[PDB]
């Protein structure tokens, strides 16, 4: 029996959000993950027998098959999306084997939501600066949030979309008046109807990680600097809205490795300003809210100054310990 990873609408079987996918085991020499349709560009990790990820970004036609050369016998298969809805999605078909399916090792008891923007997606992560981001260069399985969930032995759900904010999205001259992350968080698949995620009780995060504000703080030459009070107020409201569904979860609110106190100007002090706003939100939210620092990154970066693998891995450790400390893990 196949199990779906992450938030996947069972009415569509669309791998839409980053990190979504499937896990199963079989005995035989081969398995194929059928593909009903694919749109735009995508990339996935295929992990066989817990080995090195096979990175796939071309889905010619039929489906995704296990590698040639396996020995007849038991094998495990984990497929995970590296990339995000903005570039495309994969609609899954049926999964087949040349032998038969065997039981999966039981799913983790620990569960974590990770909510954010391009940083949480894994935008540009595999890229060498300077580079143009592509679905192939995105690498959700190497992001700070996923690496933290891995360290804690937890299942996770990534809900993230590049350029998105909490109160306002990325600063463009055309006002980017499309949905904000809270609205998107109500959807099953990323392009499904508002409110289409039913919050099934089968998924009940112990921890909810929120990393938003990099886009909100952008303003130079396009719009007014951020309304800090509104950003703070919205952060409190977003958590309260999630608590309608997951009242017992602890919340982990991160500041941005891409904001600094020197850009655009020293006066803006953007990183300190965001940091204080989040701490304020944490203070208003009470004991189940937690601030988690992410120091402004160094000069080594991926595409478009996004965090590279080392920067993600370092905060993954910080976040894993912070969640563990909060939860007694």
Residue 97 sits in the same domain as residue 120: no
Q: In what order do the strands lie in the sheet with 88-97?
A: 14-15, 88-97, 31-40, 63-65
Residue 47 sits in the same domain as residue 69: yes
Residue 209 sits in the same domain as residue 280: yes
- Which CATH number characterizes residue 38's domain? 2.60.120.260
Q: Which of 107, 122, 146 is the last residue of a domain?
A: 107
Residue 63 backbone zone (phi > 0: left; psi -120 to 50: alpha; other: beta): left
Counting the structural domains of the chain, the total is 2
Q: Cα 304 to chain center, whole Å? A: 18
Residue 309 sits in the same domain as residue 186: yes
142/155 Cα distance (integer angstroms): 15
The dihedral built from the CA positions of residue 9, 10, 11 and 14, taken in this order, carries a sign that is positive
Residue 60 sits in the same domain as residue 162: no
Residue 147 sits in the same domain as residue 225: yes
Residue 75 sits in the same domain as residue 184: no
Reference 38, options 96, 111, 110, 87; nearest CA is 87
Residue 83 sits in the same domain as residue 117: no
Give the Cα-Cα-Cα angle 295, 297, 303 (nearest 5 degrees): 145
237/110 Cα distance (integer angstroms): 25
Residue-range definition of the domain harbouring residue 157: 108-329
Residue 304 sits in the same domain as residue 235: yes
Residue 116 sits in the same domain as residue 103: no
Residue 325 in 3-state DSSP?
helix
Residue 103 sits in the same domain as residue 137: no
Q: What is the DSSP letter of 173?
A: S
Residue 184 sits in the same domain as residue 84: no
* Token pair belonging to 239: 């958590």
């Amino acid at each position: 029996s196949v199990r779906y990873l992450g938030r996947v609408n069972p009415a569509t079987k669309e791998l839409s959000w980053p990190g979504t996918g499937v896990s199963f085991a079989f005995t035989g020499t081969s398995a194929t993950i059928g593909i009903a349709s694919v749109s735009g560009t995508n990339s996935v990790d295929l992990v066989i027998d817990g080995g090195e990820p096979i990175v796939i970004s071309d889905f010619a036609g039929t489906g995704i098959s296990t590698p040639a050369g396996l020995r007849k016998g038991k094998h495990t298969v984990v497929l995970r999306r590296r990339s995000e809805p903005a570039y495309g999605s994969i609609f899954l078909g049926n999964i087949t084997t040349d032998g038969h399916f065997v039981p999966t090792a039981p799913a983790p008891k620990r569960q974590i939501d990770i909510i954010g923007d391009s940083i949480t997606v894994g935008y540009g992560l595999d890229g060498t600066f300077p580079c143009t981001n592509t679905a192939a260069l995105e690498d959700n399985p190497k992001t700070y949030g996923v690496l933290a969930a891995n360290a804690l032995g937890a299942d996770y759900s990534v809900v993230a979309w590049s350029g998105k904010g909490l109160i306002r999205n990325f600063a463009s001259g055309s006002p980017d008046t499309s949905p904000l992350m809270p609205q998107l968080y109500t959807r099953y698949g990323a392009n499904d109807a508002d409110g289409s995620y039913p919050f099934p009780r089968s998924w009940s995060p112990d921890a909810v990680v929120i990393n938003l504000g990099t886009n909100d703080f952008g303003y130079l030459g396009v719009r007014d600097p951020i309304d800090v009070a509104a950003y703070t107020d919205a952060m409190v409201k977003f958590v309260q809205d999630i608590q309608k569904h997951y009242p017992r979860a602890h919340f982990f609110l991160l500041n941005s490795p891409m904001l600094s106190d020197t850009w655009p100007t020293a006066a803006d002090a953007q990183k300190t300003t965001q940091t204080n706003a989040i701490k304020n939100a944490v203070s208003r939210l009470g004991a189940k809210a937690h601030f988690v620092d992410w120091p402004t990154q160094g000069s080594d970066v991926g595409c478009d100054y996004h965090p590279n693998a080392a920067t993600h891995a370092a905060e993954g450790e910080v976040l894993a310990k912070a969640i563990a400390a909060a939860l007694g893990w």
